[PDB]
Amino acid sequence: EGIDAVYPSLVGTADSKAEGIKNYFKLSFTLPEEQKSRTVGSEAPLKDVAQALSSRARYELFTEKETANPAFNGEVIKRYKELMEHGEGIADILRSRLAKFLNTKDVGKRFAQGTEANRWVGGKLLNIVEQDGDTFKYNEQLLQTAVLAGLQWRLTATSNTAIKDAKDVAAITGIDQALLPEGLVEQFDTGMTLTEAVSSLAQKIESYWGLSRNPNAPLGYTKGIPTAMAAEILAAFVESTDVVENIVDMSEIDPDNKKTIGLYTITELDSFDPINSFPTAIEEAVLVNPTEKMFFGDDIPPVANTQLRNPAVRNTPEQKAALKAEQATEFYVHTPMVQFYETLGKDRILELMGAGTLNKELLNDNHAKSLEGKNRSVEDSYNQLFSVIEQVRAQSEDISTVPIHYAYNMTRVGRMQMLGKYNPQSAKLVREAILPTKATLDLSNQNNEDFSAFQLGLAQALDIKVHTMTREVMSDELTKLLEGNLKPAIDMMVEFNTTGSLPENAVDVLNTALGDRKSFVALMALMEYSRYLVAEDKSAFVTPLYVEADGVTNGPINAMMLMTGGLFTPDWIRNIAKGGLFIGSPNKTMNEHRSTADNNDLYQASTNALMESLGKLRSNYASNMPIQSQIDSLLSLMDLFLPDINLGENGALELKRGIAKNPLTITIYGSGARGIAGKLVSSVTDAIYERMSDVLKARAKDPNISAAMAMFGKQAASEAHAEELLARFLKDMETLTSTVPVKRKGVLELQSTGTGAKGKINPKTYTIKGEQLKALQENMLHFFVEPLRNGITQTVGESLVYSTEQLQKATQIQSVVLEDMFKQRVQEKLAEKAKDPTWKKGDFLTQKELNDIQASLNNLAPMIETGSQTFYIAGSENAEVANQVLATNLDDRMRVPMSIYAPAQAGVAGIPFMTIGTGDGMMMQTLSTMKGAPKNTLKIFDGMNIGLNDITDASRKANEAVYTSWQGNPIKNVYESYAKFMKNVDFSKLSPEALEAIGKSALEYDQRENATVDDIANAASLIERNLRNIALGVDIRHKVLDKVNLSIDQMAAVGAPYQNNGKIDLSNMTPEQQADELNKLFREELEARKQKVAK
């Protein structure tokens, strides 16, 4: 009688075992104990809410608050009057589409005779209708409340959707990640798919309805009825031209693919629309506890209870404390930076920091696609920032004294991420306008310690390697720039502060002065320095300039410290010193190491090893003439378009440290050899497309120019030199696309493909794809990637790559078993429902039944616990388990598949989870909750912005947090979960498909052709004892390193190292001598543990 008294006019009885028509709306939802929405019980929600928005006094009375938001002024009130009238016309469209549905094929006539038309996949909206004469009609309270949710969704959906990477697009389309076309990713994130639009809209509808789900009701109605309403509202928005629908066909690019995907984009409002200063008036008027809002002053966001998009995992108490500290920081608006942005204008901002205007008649088709994506990011960030400024400006007359708070949540890899799309932590344009840092300095004397901090901040913003030089040397470098190239730019900024105007050629002045140092952070350095020059009182200068403590190769260094076992080697000691770990050198900073000891970082070290491997490969095939020519063509092509590859006049090959940046970072991230090859080739094709645009530009200026000079005009001193380069380009492309190398029996053989490149090119629409693209990747994989991966292994160590292999095998095997049991357990439950008369196919399972299936998997240890963090590698949301349609609209379109939260195969995702989660993720968690933690800082991943008044103390604390995170044992945590899984697993109950996947990870190629169940089980237990041996070695190494004196300078910006107060002196020793001393303590620790066990 609870919900049966609020909606007594609904069609059908509320009994699950009735005879006629049953109402599944009242059987699936229940009234809450305390109210959550103010529209429950009303008769005209679209009229009561519109009345409350007509005045400030009425808004306060309806909301029951002392005062309303100051931004809710008269201009905003007028704009909401038109929006409410627009929402009344949306309801008229919905009411007219229902009458057509009941008229075609006599649906209404049959439904009134007893036919269960409300249980259809498209008739699920018949559970919220009422009888009216001989026909049916909507329920006014339920219909008008859903319209209000659509209006709020239309205003803020874009600024809340997630960002799709290349991996996500590949899964949706089905095309291989390494063969994704040009601009496909940039097209996908512009709009949203059907599933994303409907699911997000349906979430708001349920919230506004203010009801609670029934745990014993089928998932086909608790999730289908809200979804069926969302699809109808989205269809109405398309008819009203509020949402534009675009259809992309995969058969155009891949004829073998028959998938069709629709994309929906919301039409955006004007940048001067007064509604942009307060777009959450409807949300705060309906919900008792609004979710979308901006926090001012003492308004502190609440702490989330579960991980991001991982509802099965809850934040640990240690993780919740870190979130609370990060949400207490106050942000402030820098007025001089804001006025500079609006004076320059959006057009000049795009011209300076973007691609500017585009003339598509002189651009390549593929080149123009990338330029538009660059412009979109800058333009969207500019619009988002100035909408916030409008809201802040209404709170007080002084915009610089309004504190701002931001919400945080935990990423599945243990990373604190700001909520929203464009915020200081994500957008660089917004980062320079809203700052949490402040300082007061005495700059009346140039020899003060305060002036040295001021110079350090300016130098780092102007692209100067401050962590590789001493303070005195850095000061000399900055002085030359200030009085040299940057002088014209400073003069313009000085006039701007006093007057407030800019010249018509301001873009050209900044472009010439900055050059290769152009960035958003470099603009603030010019303004801050110019403001200091005109300050009347330099002894109390207040500035928001900061210094960023950036880690030196944070990724690779963490891996070699956390997942390395065995005895110490001199090579490890030398290579780990480049990361900031010094043994036997008290109070040694990174600036001293680079200046005197070693000036090569990890990126340069791997480049040198790559040259060594490349020379050995050529010498192996010295007698093979066809193989030698193929290697020459690959290097020749990369020399023409990549600045990191250079060939001398004598044929000597020279490489730069910039060729191993990306490969080294993604190698630690578990990416395979094919992934590196695909990215390397993509860099070459981008340069080729850009060179085609120069051909079109040169032809327009001079139609009589030659083809060679139109291409390599600026890369050749004479015309004859230009003709030489053109011949090289044509020959290399034909050679690299005609034959490919095939690795058989351990040797490489050239095999023809028959799909070589022929004909005359067209600069406007030149494209490389199909079999031509695959031929290029085959040559790159076997001739350049293989030598590259050998050099990387030599630097990081052979033991580190051994730990990654066992970790990948252990996680993949566990995920395969979990996925098979989940699918095998929901099919047995469905077979039981077939004997239930009150059950129909399409209702799926129940939330109570789904929770029992997941609880039965607890004896296999699906989650990894480290004591302060939790990880769930196999968790995902997929529609494979349900394999059925959830709901459609009244036109039998917009079919939405049903997706549930079920485990899935891991693959190579195990390595990134533990390298990042226990690496920089744990370091930043400690830094926010440690004793005497730094205050007023912005914590970007592997970085931290610090004010000029606390650079020394905060840098020392950052190095202390790094040392704490190096005492962990990620392998031991994985071993403990894997040992429990092996105790309870039963391989004899696995499907034949599952047994084939496990054999691909535990056995060799020859051993898995006819392997039995016993062979697979025996091979899986071997991995268990491999993890135990690795984990024991890591534990001993950390114990030994804690007994000696160490200096930690991983955050090398300032030069404030941290000492571990060890009591063993290893100074005045070579790395060869230190390894022997460390190995002596390693053998003593092993003996004690074995002796203790014996006792």
Author numbering: 1007 to 2101
According to the publication:
N4-like phages have a genome size of about 75 kb, nearly twice that of T7, and encode around 70–90 ORFs, including a characteristic large virion-associated RNA polymerase (vRNAP) unique to this family of bacterial viruses. The massive 3,500-residue vRNAP 18,19, present in 4 ± 1 copies inside the mature virion 20, is ejected into the host upon infection. In stark contrast to the N4 transcriptional program, which has been studied extensively 17, many key questions about the role of phage N4 vRNAP as an ejection protein and its part in the DNA ejectosome remain unanswered. vRNAP (gp50) consists of three predicted domains: a likely membrane-spanning N-terminal domain (NTD), a single-subunit RNA polymerase (RNAP) domain, and a large C-terminal domain of unknown function (CTD). In this study, we use a complementary top-down and bottom-up approach by determining the cryo-EM structures of both the full-length recombinantly expressed vRNAP and the fully asymmetric N4 virion tail.
Single particle analysis (SPA) of cryomicrographs revealed a heterogeneous mix of particles with two predominant and two minor populations. N4 isolated RNAP and ΔN-vRNAP tight complex were real-space refined to a model to map correlation coefficients of CC = 0.90 and 0.84, respectively. N4 RNAP domain adopts a typical single subunit RNAP (ssRNAP) fold that resembles a right hand with three subdomains: fingers, palm, and thumb. Without the CTD, the B-motif loop is folded into a beta hairpin that sits outside the active site. Thus, vRNAP can be rationalized as three globular, folded units flexibly connected by at least two extended linkers. These linkers may explain why SPA of vitrified vRNAP also captured individual RNAP and CTD domains if the two domains are separate in a “split complex”. We performed radiolabeled runoff transcriptional assays using both the full-length (FL) vRNAP and the RNAP domain alone on an 81-nt N4 native sequence ssDNA template, which contained the P1 hairpin promoter. However, the FL enzyme synthesized less RNA product as a function of time, consistent with the proposed autoinhibitory effect of the CTD.
